[PDB]
Amino acid sequence: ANIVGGIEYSINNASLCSVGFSVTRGATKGFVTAGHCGTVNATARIGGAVVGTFAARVFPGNDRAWVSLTSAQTLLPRVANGSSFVTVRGSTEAAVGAAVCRSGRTTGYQCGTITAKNITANYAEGAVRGLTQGNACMGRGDSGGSWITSAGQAQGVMSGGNVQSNGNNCGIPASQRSSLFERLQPILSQYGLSLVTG
């Protein structure tokens, strides 16, 4: 399978999440994604085909994971935006007020601006601390997906958001949205990962 940021993958034939970013770890191919998407060794499938298994994760507290892929997989320096792509150029962290977009299998490519950093979300399982908030909207299924600036700088992975009863927060004004992502830089250093760029 071609590994692109933003696309669907299932976990143990049950849950769906979105791919965050293509990474490598020495000779190992992987992609980063949300920690709440699966437990260690849960099986990742893309289009029915098995592509790898979760290698490590931290959730709750943080919300991060990486899936180690089989050698057959093709890592690409790209995030899906409709039928077109955004190239990952690096991982410079944008400041509050910067414009940002996110990519995911439920609401597609959506954009908004970073409104706050170091936000705690209280989920059913426990507190996740240190998240960044943007007001780009999202839906259930978008978890794990890429957050990236239009300039190609990778920001983090989708964690949670104040989704309404239709499954997303796209139907309330940007002002009322709280879409939270996990920062990419601590995930890259904690697992010794390098981002695939182009």
Curated annotation (Swiss-Prot):
The active site is at residues 36, 63, 143. Disulfide bonds join 17-37, 101-111, 137-170. Belongs to the peptidase S1 family. This is Alpha-lytic protease. It comes from Lysobacter enzymogenes. The chain holds residues 200 to 397 of 397 of the full protein.
